Design an enzyme around this catalytic site. Structure first.
Site, PDB file in Angstrom:
ATOM      1  N   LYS A  80      -7.642 -11.715  15.885  1.00 39.84           N
ATOM      2  CA  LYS A  80      -8.729 -10.766  15.719  1.00 39.84           C
ATOM      3  C   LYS A  80      -9.872 -11.196  16.625  1.00 39.84           C
ATOM      4  O   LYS A  80     -10.210 -12.379  16.679  1.00 39.84           O
ATOM      5  CB  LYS A  80      -9.195 -10.713  14.261  1.00 39.84           C
ATOM      6  CG  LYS A  80     -10.416  -9.833  13.994  1.00 39.84           C
ATOM      7  CD  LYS A  80     -11.723 -10.646  13.944  1.00 39.84           C
ATOM      8  CE  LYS A  80     -11.711 -11.676  12.811  1.00 39.84           C
ATOM      9  NZ  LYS A  80     -12.969 -12.468  12.700  1.00 39.84           N
ATOM     10  N   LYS A 107       2.180  -9.043  -1.777  1.00 39.68           N
ATOM     11  CA  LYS A 107       0.902  -9.450  -2.334  1.00 39.68           C
ATOM     12  C   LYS A 107       0.332  -8.312  -3.152  1.00 39.68           C
ATOM     13  O   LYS A 107       0.126  -7.215  -2.629  1.00 39.68           O
ATOM     14  CB  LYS A 107      -0.070  -9.849  -1.228  1.00 39.68           C
ATOM     15  CG  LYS A 107      -1.371 -10.426  -1.728  1.00 39.68           C
ATOM     16  CD  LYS A 107      -2.525 -10.012  -0.853  1.00 39.68           C
ATOM     17  CE  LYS A 107      -3.841 -10.221  -1.562  1.00 39.68           C
ATOM     18  NZ  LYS A 107      -4.901  -9.338  -1.020  1.00 39.68           N
ATOM     19  N   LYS A 162       0.849  -1.173   0.000  1.00 37.60           N
ATOM     20  CA  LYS A 162       0.000   0.000   0.000  1.00 37.60           C
ATOM     21  C   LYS A 162       0.891   1.230   0.000  1.00 37.60           C
ATOM     22  O   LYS A 162       1.974   1.205   0.595  1.00 37.60           O
ATOM     23  CB  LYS A 162      -0.947   0.009   1.206  1.00 37.60           C
ATOM     24  CG  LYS A 162      -2.091  -0.967   1.028  1.00 37.60           C
ATOM     25  CD  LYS A 162      -2.783  -1.292   2.329  1.00 37.60           C
ATOM     26  CE  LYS A 162      -3.808  -2.389   2.114  1.00 37.60           C
ATOM     27  NZ  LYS A 162      -4.483  -2.783   3.379  1.00 37.60           N
ATOM     28  N   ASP A 170      -2.681  -6.355  -4.681  1.00 37.97           N
ATOM     29  CA  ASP A 170      -3.990  -6.187  -4.088  1.00 37.97           C
ATOM     30  C   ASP A 170      -5.022  -7.049  -4.803  1.00 37.97           C
ATOM     31  O   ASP A 170      -4.782  -7.592  -5.879  1.00 37.97           O
ATOM     32  CB  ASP A 170      -4.417  -4.731  -4.119  1.00 37.97           C
ATOM     33  CG  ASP A 170      -5.570  -4.461  -3.195  1.00 37.97           C
ATOM     34  OD1 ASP A 170      -5.361  -4.479  -1.966  1.00 37.97           O
ATOM     35  OD2 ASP A 170      -6.692  -4.254  -3.695  1.00 37.97           O
ATOM     36  N   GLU A 171      -6.185  -7.179  -4.171  1.00 39.03           N
ATOM     37  CA  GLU A 171      -7.232  -8.031  -4.710  1.00 39.03           C
ATOM     38  C   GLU A 171      -7.684  -7.539  -6.070  1.00 39.03           C
ATOM     39  O   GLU A 171      -7.820  -8.323  -7.013  1.00 39.03           O
ATOM     40  CB  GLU A 171      -8.426  -8.043  -3.760  1.00 39.03           C
ATOM     41  CG  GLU A 171      -8.093  -8.399  -2.337  1.00 39.03           C
ATOM     42  CD  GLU A 171      -7.735  -7.192  -1.491  1.00 39.03           C
ATOM     43  OE1 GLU A 171      -7.888  -6.057  -1.984  1.00 39.03           O
ATOM     44  OE2 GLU A 171      -7.291  -7.378  -0.338  1.00 39.03           O
ATOM     45  N   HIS A 184      -6.768 -16.173  -3.496  1.00 35.56           N
ATOM     46  CA  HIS A 184      -7.401 -15.150  -2.689  1.00 35.56           C
ATOM     47  C   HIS A 184      -8.902 -15.346  -2.754  1.00 35.56           C
ATOM     48  O   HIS A 184      -9.452 -15.628  -3.818  1.00 35.56           O
ATOM     49  CB  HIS A 184      -7.037 -13.758  -3.177  1.00 35.56           C
ATOM     50  CG  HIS A 184      -7.518 -12.678  -2.277  1.00 35.56           C
ATOM     51  ND1 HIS A 184      -6.702 -12.066  -1.354  1.00 35.56           N
ATOM     52  CD2 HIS A 184      -8.739 -12.117  -2.134  1.00 35.56           C
ATOM     53  CE1 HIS A 184      -7.399 -11.167  -0.686  1.00 35.56           C
ATOM     54  NE2 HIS A 184      -8.638 -11.182  -1.138  1.00 35.56           N
TER      55      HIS A 184
END
Lengths: 438, 441, 441
Positions: free
Chosen positions: B312, B179, B153, B181-182, B272
């Protein structure tokens, strides 16, 4: 915090923006504006993503309204810049819109009710291989809905028995037969054999009637090259139309198949298997509007649009909504039909709606009135009759209903009456006339 | 109406049958028995359409119906399908047969496919993951610790040269993967071939100064399978160890095609799971993600995004442990406390690495190491204001410290904070990573 | 006769329409109105041939007619074409529809297509330049200054080995590109494959001793597209960063083919505008070069020859500034003082580098740096009697000095002579370049 920059209520969309309308129920404790802004931020560049002007790429929640009738439920209209999507890629449009937001923790439930494609984006896509006018011209069937026979005694049939069933149901007078959605090539019946024998049957039918008849040969296959094998062989046999399951197979495979069909002149019938997994609950999923639009973009000439033969709430109107979100060039926004945005299709052709079924010829006038004559009626009842008799019954009844409609006559008060009036020229139609007697 | 032939509660399932466990809430007005029989009828051959050779050998059979403990008007239904109904090697046909059109059934008001048992006689006709855990660890030569990753990012709006610079800074820092991004396939601001060229240059530059085997999940999801094959073959030509694919948006036809290509050409295939929550969120409708993890392990993929765990703040982490063991071991018992309804035997088909992603920072490092073990990937997709190479170094120091503490004999779940705060004495990058996030459990 | 239906002065153009601005002088005996309507009729569907479904949705519409200020019996006519008339992605079809057969119209005595506005809905269906300005600067890794070039001379009659020596001497001197001549494809005295081999050897030799990324616009213009594909693929195999093509002689079919090939194979595509003056010289007939610059940016090309500016003694340099901004920015306002008639929005399609060529020497260096900025190429096609490597070094010193003076804060248009004569104190090559040409403005 997202509302600080992702919520722009005084913002107006551009003619080159992708507009998405969500229906969301937020978690107890967060206001609708924060959740809408968060939906905007998650389906695009999130928070903390910086050194560049990363603002021409942000989605923007430009509208939030409470839906009437439901508590803790809202609509959020979000606007995505055009330079976020790969041209010609339905998969990228999806994985940008719906790829991440549906699992947002601060939202109890999320649904994508509609999405507006700009003309600047509609143009990039090939669209339906042929459309409506082109495929009517290819088959030479004008001013009448097309008829379909689903050979439901499906699995325990040998390839030659399947071929004879197809031949006899088409000899009765239907236009298409259909491979069931879950018969690709299985130990009891391999694909190439079924293709051979239904091709022989189709040629026998065209030879004895003079009309262009077809069979939606299912080419859904485990791999793209195996799918291409099946499609190429279907074309080699001279098959005018094939079949595909765009949701199970995917949008990559379906776009590939559509581009192949455009280049080879075979109509691409689409079956919406697995659809109810993502559009049945009004609180979560992706409304079949979005999927009908994504199909019309990706590729496909027919599309299973279900039916309206008793599921007639305002819901039925919603059906009508998408059934002209994929037949017309311009659709005005009117939430009474579920069409949230006005969609301009830039003369991209339209796909044919396929009526779910109800071999019962008692809503056939109702279906001719609902879907019009630019549609396919797929009597998924195995052609019960008492075969060729049931096929003749369906065909004669359709011709009667359409001839009555052409004469300015009503087909909702005069439905059973016109069916009984027609049933007096052939015993086959008499054997199945109305809500009973099949 | 249906119950007379499709409901056989005495029938016992063969080892060569496909077992599906639905979770259905029926409409008020129909019994659970009739509705389970109706599910069995509609998913397999239904409507008794046997005009034209007795198809009773193809029917599914609802061999079990039970009420779910602690909820009203909701049941589990176990149905068995003959092996002869499914095309060998086709995940799409499995889906089209099982979940084809039973979800839109009227008599049921909600339906959720919670599990499927694949018979060994059917697991054996799929390729499976291109490489699997052992082969993939051998290719990368990374043993005895989880694998590290970073999502690059700024997500969008980066020039390919800058995207490459970012990838090089991460990998040089000490991670093992970056990675894509999607939703970055090929867009006006950044076309794919440019991205591939520059990230390949970055990967080579970082492999030079490190000696390890770095990588980048080059997103090859494309509008057509021709185009994704072009992207994958250009990624191979550049000598890229691993590529990426979004198996749910793209589909299973395309993902199976890509998996076969990856096996033939020796690239690891990272998966993914974008678009999944459209399906596996609502506990009353959809398809549980473990069914999709099984269908992926069949179709093909070396890595798979498995979300995250009580690292999480989480409730049913038993379910995530269950489907991590479903995609990673060879034999799993029907432990319905962990969401596993059927005992699944995989017949030596390799395992798929679970990838832990989504809201993870250095403080979650110990918990994850305990939860996923060392056969997993940790994607640390905020930005450690020292930069991105320092953040990579911090994550690397944290992972190695936690792994040596685990193999030492410490209880990392009770001493994660202590081991991290003690390792922070010898890497200021990790010290910054520690005092950034306020030690959220 | 035509005016009744094809002249709609009230109609306003949609954002999804194609706007053409003709400049026409009508025959003595017909009004400007009838002639504009006739242009609209003939370019789109004309002759009212609607025997066999009302084609009024396809007709062009002359929505504006005005008299040009300062000239008699000459007008501008703005016509609007529906988006549905043009094949997506085809520049040739745009040309065939717009400028198909209206130039040979009788009632008009002179016609010149001055501008076209492409709707975003149509810009989006072209590939555009293979790479564009940003991507091309990234590939070459040359930032913050214009790019330098030299056309190799002796033009003809050089042995491929000597051609290689010349290219190596230039590039070693400090330039960034050498340019094959316009009309050197493959001729008895020098076949193409030999030229490619030796210039590739030269490029590698010079990259070795310099560390920068040198290049040569290998002319791939060939008699057939098979042959130009052979030439382009052999240029790629040699690892050549950039090739060349003459888009007007070769055509737009071939240029679009080559542009797609270059995008797929990562070579920058330099465009040369030979044969243009056959069209865009006479102010009363032809096609203004800005229309061809737009059509190129659509079809494909990273560089494009844009002539030169008041560096060469010039009148309407506003027009050249206009079409430099048309092929280089993303949004341009309808500033008709700069020849831009319509506001053209490019929808993030990349930009095309303007190449300044034709009668340029070191003294023009400052002016050009002010005119084209730093996103441009300067081709210095006399021969600096010290040789050709010294001339290259002189041009390089001049460009770097002028660029650092511009970024310093000097007014290069008023101080170009001073900055050049002061930089000449530290490079005798530039001193020779200065005292050769007599400081022509």
């Amino acid at each position: 915090d997202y509302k600080l920059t992702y919520y722009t209520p005084d913002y107006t969309p551009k003619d080159t923006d992708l507009l998405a309308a969500f229906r969301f129920s937020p978690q107890p404790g967060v206001p609708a504006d924060e959740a809408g802004a968060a939906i905007a931020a998650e389906s695009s560049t999130g928070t903390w993503t910086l050194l560049t002007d990363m603002d021409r790429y942000k989605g923007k929640c430009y509208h939030i309204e409470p839906v009437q009738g439901e508590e803790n439920s809202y609509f959020a209209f979000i606007a995505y810049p055009l330079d976020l999507f790969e041209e010609g890629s339905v998969t990228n449009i999806l994985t940008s819109i719906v790829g991440n937001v549906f699992g947002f923790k601060a939202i109890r439930s999320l649904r994508l009710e509609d999405i507006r494609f700009p003309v600047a984006l509609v143009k990039t896509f090939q669209g339906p291989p042929h459309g409506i006018q082109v495929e009517r011209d290819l088959l030479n069937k004008y001013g009448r809905p097309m008829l379909g026979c689903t050979i439901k005694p499906k699995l325990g049939l040998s390839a030659k028995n399947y071929g004879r069933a197809v031949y006899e149901c088409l000899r009765g007078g239907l236009d298409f037969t259909k491979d069931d959605e879950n018969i690709n090539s299985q130990p009891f019946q391999r694909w190439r054999d079924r293709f051979l024998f239904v091709a022989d049957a189709i040629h026998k039918s065209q030879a004895e009637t003079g009309e262009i008849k077809g069979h939606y040969l299912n080419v859904t296959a485990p791999t793209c090259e195996e799918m291409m094998k099946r499609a190429e062989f279907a074309k080699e046999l001279g098959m005018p139309i094939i079949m595909h399951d765009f949701l199970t197979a995917g949008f990559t495979a379906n776009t590939t198949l559509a581009k192949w069909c455009r280049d080879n002149g075979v109509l691409l019938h689409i079956h919406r298997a697995m659809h109810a997994v993502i559009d049945r609950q009004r609180n979560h999923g992706i409304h079949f509007r979005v999927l009908a639009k994504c199909l019309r973009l990706s590729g496909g000439d027919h599309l299973h649009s279900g039916t309206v033969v008793g599921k007639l709430e305002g819901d039925k109107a919603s059906t009508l909504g998408f059934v002209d979100l994929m037949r017309e060039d311009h659709i005005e926004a009117d939430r009474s039909r579920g069409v949230f945005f006005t969609q301009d299709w830039a003369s991209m052709p339209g796909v044919l709606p396929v009526a779910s079924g109800g071999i019962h010829v008692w809503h056939m006038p109702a279906l001719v009135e609902i879907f019009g004559d630019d549609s396919v009626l797929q009597f998924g009842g195995g052609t019960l009759g008492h075969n060729a008799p049931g096929a003749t019954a369906n065909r004669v009844a359709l011709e009667a209903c359409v001839q009555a409609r052409n004469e300015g006559r009503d087909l909702y008060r005069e439905g059973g009456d016109i069916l009984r009036e027609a049933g007096k020229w052939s015993p086959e139609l008499a054997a199945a006339l109305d809500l009973w007697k099949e």
